[PDB]
Design a protein around this ligand. Structure first.
Ligand SMILES: CC(=O)N[C@H]1[C@H](O[C@H]2[C@@H](O)[C@@H](CO)O[C@@H](O[C@H]3[C@H](O)[C@@H](O)[C@H](O)O[C@@H]3CO)[C@@H]2O)O[C@H](CO)[C@@H](O[C@@H]2O[C@H](CO[C@]3(C(=O)O)C[C@H](O)[C@@H](NC(C)=O)[C@H]([C@H](O)[C@H](O)CO)O3)[C@H](O)[C@H](O)[C@H]2O)[C@@H]1O
Ligand SMILES: *[C@@H]1O[C@H](CO[C@@H]2O[C@H](CO)[C@@H](O)[C@H](O)[C@H]2NC(C)=O)[C@@H](O[C@@H]2O[C@H](CO)[C@@H](O)[C@H](O)[C@H]2NC(C)=O)[C@H](O)[C@H]1NC(C)=O
Ligand SMILES: *[C@@H]1O[C@H](CO)[C@@H](O[C@@H]2O[C@H](CO)[C@@H](O)[C@H](O)[C@H]2NC(C)=O)[C@H](O)[C@H]1NC(C)=O
Ligand SMILES: *[C@@H]1O[C@H](CO)[C@@H](O[C@@H]2O[C@H](CO)[C@@H](O)[C@H](O)[C@H]2NC(C)=O)[C@H](O)[C@H]1NC(C)=O
Ligand SMILES: *[C@@H]1O[C@H](CO)[C@@H](O[C@@H]2O[C@H](CO)[C@@H](O)[C@H](O)[C@H]2NC(C)=O)[C@H](O)[C@H]1NC(C)=O
Ligand SMILES: *[C@@H]1O[C@H](CO)[C@@H](O)[C@H](O)[C@H]1NC(C)=O
Lengths: 160, 317
């Protein structure tokens, strides 16, 4: 996708990541494990939640169409009325469908960007103390226990 | 040792579409289109509908003798005319501007009858009836006919002092023969006039047999109008007039709908009503009907409008 992370160079998702959309997985002597990154995830939750609310707010207004009765000699007025109703419906249906299709693309690309931004944040922090394996992982050049791992996650890793 | 960045994958089967791809798998999505309804006619935030099962709107307005149950007046959110409603104009004839009348009526949220011309004011017979009307007659008008082989010129007046507009009705009889004409009005050449400060209408009969309807060859042309506050209605006739008797005071504004269906009604309340049923929802759209009214979402003719919330669902396996 646009930002190259999701279904990109980080080929698959993690079923083990249950708390949120984005996170970290580490591997050291003490073992392997993963956890969602709260900061990035909560920020994404607020934005999309906000987008949903605004879409609902902007599009829930109704339009009124009354099935008026017309006499034998009002065939033209009848066609004119039908033209109005048909276009009101077609235009709003078009707006509704496109808004959803287009925003769906942005939503998907934003999650992709959030993953990319998180990956680049860690790469920046690690500096030359690690090398990218090209799949979303950073092979550290020094032993790094859980406490060390935590500094990378909470962004206080020493030696940026 | 190493640390990796990743994203969530789930067993969600939810998918969404975009302009450059369809059925994209996603971890979380939200359906924005409401598609359910209760299959019933209910009351809305404006009240209960006026359900007409034997009488048509004009039958009610003119007081067809078979619609007595409605004489006391009603108030409604919307109107429902069942396909069984067939009691309209019992005596053969047509209503001028019927569509406008039915529309004007349905737009109000209530009616209350008001007497315009008391039976006493007439100097001629006023209780004429017909077999076409259950051996009776309209409660909104009086079929004036001669009394004692005499039909003096009738000239009555009424002034709207109710501070509200009054919808009133009247008719012009067209006998099938000259004998019936003289027989009812004493003369073959009559002149009827209905007037106010605004309108000035006059009518003259045209005797002759029309095709049979309700076992009759004669006819009555029906009319209506609205006497505004302060205005004065006046009727003069020397025959053929079907005088205004009771009028209606219309009030408020309803949803202004006339649903012609036999859908079941129930003891229910909904925010949004349609001819197929009602619904309650917080979703922005619905695909139940473009005719929906009340407190409704926006109608959209589609089966689904699934909005992406989570990210692309990519299975590792
Ligand atoms: C009894 C008789 O002679 N029958 C006549 C009928 O007579 C009506 C006439 O004299 C008028 C004139 O004032 O007075 C009616 O009396 C009313 C009375 O004032 C009122 O107090 C009481 O409540 O109601 C009655 C009736 O409403 C006399 O009844 O006149 C008609 C027309 O000349 C004669 O023709 C035959 O009519 C047959 C249809 O019958 C009715 C009907 O439509 O049901 C009977 C109704 O009573 C009558 N209504 C009125 C107000 O007259 C109508 C009406 O005259 C016609 O619809 C007009 O077209 O007729 C049938 O059509 C048959 O084929 C005709 O030969 C009838 O014999
Ligand atoms: C559909 O909604 C009816 C009332 O509409 C709105 O309902 C919401 C509930 O989320 C309420 O907060 C709003 O105040 C209300 N809007 C109005 C008109 O102000 C529901 O009607 C209720 O029905 C119960 C039945 O026992 C009755 O006791 C309540 O008085 C009545 N409320 C109103 C306002 O009439 C209706 O139940 C609901 N339909 C469904 C499917 O439950
Ligand atoms: C990020 O994680 C590190 C490691 O857990 C935290 O650093 C420790 O902070 C405590 C304070 O309670 C100190 O007593 C320890 O000495 C620190 N550990 C070491 C050796 O680094 C750090 O506080 C966390 N920072 C944030 C922003 O949460
Ligand atoms: C019916 O007849 C009565 C009396 O013949 C009419 O009443 C009179 O009408 C005149 C003119 O409108 C007034 O000047 C009198 O004050 C009225 N007095 C009476 C006798 O009531 C009445 O207007 C007639 N109504 C009809 C059917 O035209
Ligand atoms: C409104 O939306 C529904 C659901 O998307 C449309 O589809 C039918 O929905 C029912 C109930 O969910 C299913 O049982 C049917 O199989 C669906 N039919 C098809 C082929 O779509 C429904 O048609 C829409 N209503 C209107 C009036 O268009
Ligand atoms: C997810 O689906 C797979 C295969 O259908 C299944 O083995 C696994 O148990 C599921 N995960 C959960 C949370 O049940």
């Amino acid at each position: 996708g646009l930002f190259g992370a999701i279904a990109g160079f980080i080929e698959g998702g993690w079923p083990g990541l249950v708390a949120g959309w984005y996170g970290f997985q580490h591997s050291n002597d003490q073992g392997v494990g993963m956890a969602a990154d709260s900061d990035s995830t909560q920020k994404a939750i607020d934005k999309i939640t906000s987008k949903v609310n605004n879409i609902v707010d902007k599009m829930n207004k109704q339009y009124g169409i009354i099935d008026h009765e017309f006499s034998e000699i009002e065939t033209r007025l009848n066609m004119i009325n039908n033209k109005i109703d048909d276009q009101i419906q077609d235009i709003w249906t078009y707006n509704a469908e496109l808004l959803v299709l287009l925003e769906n693309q942005k939503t998907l690309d934003e999650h992709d960007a959030n993953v990319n931004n998180l990956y680049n944040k860690v790469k920046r922090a690690l500096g030359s103390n690690a090398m990218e394996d090209g799949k979303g992982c950073f092979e550290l050049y020094h032993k790094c226990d859980d406490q060390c791992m935590e500094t990378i996650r909470n962004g206080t890793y020493n030696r940026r | 040792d190493k640390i990796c960045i990743g994203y969530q994958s789930t067993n969600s089967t939810e998918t969404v579409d975009t302009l450059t791809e369809t059925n994209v798998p996603v971890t979380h999505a939200k359906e924005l289109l409401h598609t359910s309804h209760n299959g019933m006619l209910c009351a809305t935030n404006l009240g209960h509908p006026l359900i007409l099962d034997t009488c048509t709107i004009e039958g009610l307005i003119y007081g067809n003798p078979s619609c007595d149950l409605l004489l006391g007046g009603r108030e409604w959110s919307y109107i429902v005319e069942r396909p069984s409603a067939v009691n309209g104009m019992c005596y053969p004839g047509n209503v001028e501007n019927l569509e406008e009348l039915r529309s004007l009526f349905s737009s109000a949220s209530s009616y209350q009858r008001i007497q315009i011309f008391p039976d006493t004011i007439w100097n001629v017979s006023y209780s004429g009836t017909s077999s076409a009307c259950s051996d009776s007659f309209y409660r909104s008008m009086r079929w004036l006919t001669q009394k004692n082989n005499a039909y003096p010129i009738q000239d009555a007046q009424y002034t709207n002092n109710r501070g509200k507009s009054i919808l009133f009705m009247w008719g012009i009889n067209h006998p099938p023969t000259d004998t019936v004409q003289t027989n009812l009005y004493t003369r073959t050449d009559t002149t009827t006039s209905v007037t106010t400060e605004d309108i000035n209408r006059t009518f003259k009969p045209v005797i002759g047999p029309r095709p049979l309807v309700n076992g009759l060859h004669g006819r009555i042309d029906y009319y209506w109008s609205v006497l505004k506050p302060g205005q004065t209605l006046r009727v003069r006739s020397n025959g053929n007039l079907i005088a205004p008797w009771y009028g209606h005071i219309l009030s408020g504004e309803s949803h202004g709908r006339i649903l012609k269906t036999d859908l079941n009604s129930g003891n229910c309340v909904v925010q949004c009503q349609t001819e197929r049923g009602g619904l309650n929802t917080t979703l922005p759209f619905h695909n139940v009907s473009k005719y929906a009214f009340g407190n409704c979402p926006k109608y959209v003719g589609v089966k689904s409008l699934k909005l992406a919330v989570g990210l692309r669902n990519v299975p590792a396996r």
